[PDB]
């Protein structure tokens, strides 16, 4: 396993990406490659929440992926989230596509994971980059590689639909009212989707999650949806790896079995080697 | 264990239930009252499938509780479907709080479970019988008990949404409109709902779950919600128990979660002993 | 589901049975056939323990098979449990055969299953009804069928291993001492054997499942073993539904596994229907 | 997550560590210390096996702790892998001592885990590393910390019991035939062990970890045994990651639930943070 953290300067503004490679096991006589996850976590488009960076790499790549996690843009200076976070996202498929060969990474099984905030950028993106019209006017043409699939944990889907609380903090996020909600961005071009969340969530309420699913079913994209009955907000991995130091409310253990739910439908999707 | 099938004749339309009794475990230095699941297996309102009988009755019943199949009425004989299914319901509840100390059953922990074309009449049940001018409309005065929660496995829940397929079959199941669409029942009164289905079903189209879920939600009721992302309509328990000889679509391993799922969800609710 | 309760007349010591019959599922285009197991619950030979009767055998029945609680011979009145327990499985397995076509029953599939006091009597069983010569010695001449493999949970296998405490109680259960160890019957000729116990068992000690394994292995007979790291004697299902009221210690959700990891073995034995 | 490859230089043979440290999550307010588990691969004392290294420590860091993968002395030169394998342990631990500031490693939970060959020598240390007088004998004195518990996959336990095949291979190992059988080095002072295998193991013979474990029981030491009932020697996680390409013999899904029997060991222990 070798850790790189990097900047990528091949987008409008420069980001950081942190990847976790998979090291080819010695005693295998062919090589293997494996899938890769990006993961974009939560952290209110105002910071990027470490809850939902190392722990959640670590969990997947325990599966047999390569990881990157992707620092995508955030509200800071004067600088919104968009367009830039889009074009970001493809600066970083495309980038692992000139590193595939070294790394051995399977191209054609590049998955997407974002979770609360992070889930917007992603299912925004999951829209915007399956659309060529869309692909030209967010500046996504000339880059290589596509994603095959995405995860969605607990994410901001709709920026009208309770997060955020004020028109004032959306319109920092971004005033191009064309990307406020992602569900309406869904074709049946999009990729297929998992999606988790709880129905307890105060702070994004799951009607997000629920509009996105929907619009998925009704433009017949694959997809698989798990609304566990409890939890707060920003589960993580909903143990005790992720559980803030003594609080409870971060463990739930129905909702602490997404990522195996996960890993068999990427399985059944024949997106990850199956056992 | 022991088992009752008799004839309920405390309805306009009597019927047939199979009734699944816990016996006392005789080790034990005190007795235990025990929950009770009601279950309505499908069959399009023209059978009733055993495939959503027994098999699911006896995997419930290993978790700790009683259970009693219910043949709500059909369509055969040119026949509508309601009002009458909620009468039974209501008698089939009624019938239960006669039997209580007889079978030690914990009457506030009785549990309705619909399945497909079944699932239409317990998620109706459980918007009408706990608003009390439903109760009235409906002829469900002097039915004593109520149950606590229900569990809806791939449920039709509006008959506009797919299933049945013609105007001519919505109607013969009732011509009364006000009970097509459980969703549009839903009240904060409502009780908690665990709804799976998958997102594949060709026969009656997850909308309908979704649906329901959302009306739940929007409501303020306790619901949870797992919609697998392969499978098709009507697995059952989704293993080999219910599987029809030969056919391996029947067989769906991340489907086949979903009685843990429900039995895990029923403990958090209060509603099934804790380990 | 039937249930039949009745007393079988074909040995020495008449006794009782329970048996749980699994109907067959109406929907199913063509009849199938079941395998079934039998159950000889605990009670150190003194009474027969309800804990491990209708719990385990309802456990097994939602997997897809018929069960039959046999109340086996006890030292009650002041008797011996021996020969007498070992004609009255092999009578129960006779009575089997001639209910086969009656039931569904796929006789090739049959499965012997003992806790604790009722496991000396499978785990004696499985090598003397393997031996033509013992099966002369204690006639078991014209029984019919034969069983195909055995679970063992927390069983006494050694009575000079811990239990029972004394040799005027040992020699109670049977004077021939011959039958007093279960592993030194062990030979190739053996049915595959699913053994489970607790380490910390204080009234059986460990020492007796890890015996009869040991033997197992040494005579090439396929063998499953899964000592638990904590839990009391006499767990059963180790799960709220076998739980004493009130008493946390007959909880382990370590070893509630148990029965998943017995039906996925049998599954692999080829005796039970895979998913 | 920091990776660190060095040698350390504080035993008679100086060796290489590969350690992977957990970074402290951002947005945590207090600080946590992690358990940290030392991995000895298998390899057959001649070679390190890459599949039991960073697949393992992977998996294990994805629940929360530290790793690290520990290059003991191989048969290698004119060199024997004892009495030095085990000095080369104790140096890895005492290191870990020097550096749990640092990294916030909990040193009350230093875990060991040998799979196979490695399993003989942490199998080996348990015993030697607990009693005084072996201690100094093998050079031990004067380095700091202990290890909390075992886990041993599929070990060599016995060099006499059919690993290796020949004598002359034993001696390679070691002449010093007091360190040839572990488990008649274990005393109530042992460390409690995990301890798994598959009963068809036909290059290190089951009796091997029976017999640990055996003697573990009878010097009351707690312990955990899972003897799954097929799969071949050396599956490592028995899943698609440590799977040789193309070969369905690495495969087996129901030893693969050992990773979690053996985290919820651990959490069991107080050994690990539960949730």
Chains 1, 2, 3, 4 share one sequence.
């Not at 000139?98 to 994971?113: E, F, G, M, P």
Request: overall charge negative.
């Amino acid at each position: 396993m070798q850790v790189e953290q990097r900047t990528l300067n091949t987008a409008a503004h420069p980001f950081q990406i942190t990847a976790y490679w998979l090291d080819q096991i010695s005693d295998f006589e062919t090589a293997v490659d494996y899938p890769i996850m990006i993961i974009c976590p939560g952290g209110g488009f105002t910071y990027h929440s470490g809850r939902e960076e190392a722990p959640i790499a670590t969990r997947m790549m325990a599966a047999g992926m390569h990881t990157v996690v992707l620092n995508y843009q955030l509200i800071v200076g004067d600088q919104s989230v968009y367009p830039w976070a889009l074009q970001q996202l493809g600066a970083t498929i495309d980038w692992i596509t000139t590193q595939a060969s070294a790394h051995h990474v399977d191209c054609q099984r590049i998955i997407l994971a974002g979770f609360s905030a992070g889930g917007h950028v992603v299912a925004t993106y999951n829209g915007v980059a399956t659309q060529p019209e869309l692909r030209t006017r967010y500046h996504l043409d000339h880059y290589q590689g596509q994603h095959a699939a995405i995860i969605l944990g607990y994410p901001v889907i709709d920026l009208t639909a309770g997060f955020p609380t004020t028109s004032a903090a959306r319109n920092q996020i971004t005033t191009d009212a064309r990307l406020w909600a992602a569900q309406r961005l869904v074709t049946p071009a999009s990729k297929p989707a998992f999606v988790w969340q709880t129905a307890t969530d105060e702070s994004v309420p799951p009607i997000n999650s629920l509009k996105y699913v929907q619009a998925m079913l009704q433009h017949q994209v694959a997809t698989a949806y798990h609304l566990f009955g409890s939890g707060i907000h920003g589960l993580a991995l909903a143990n005790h790896v992720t559980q803030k130091p003594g609080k409870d409310k971060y463990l739930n253990d129905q909702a602490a079995i997404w990522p195996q739910l996960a890993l068999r439908w990427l399985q059944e999707q024949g997106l990850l080697a199956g056992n």
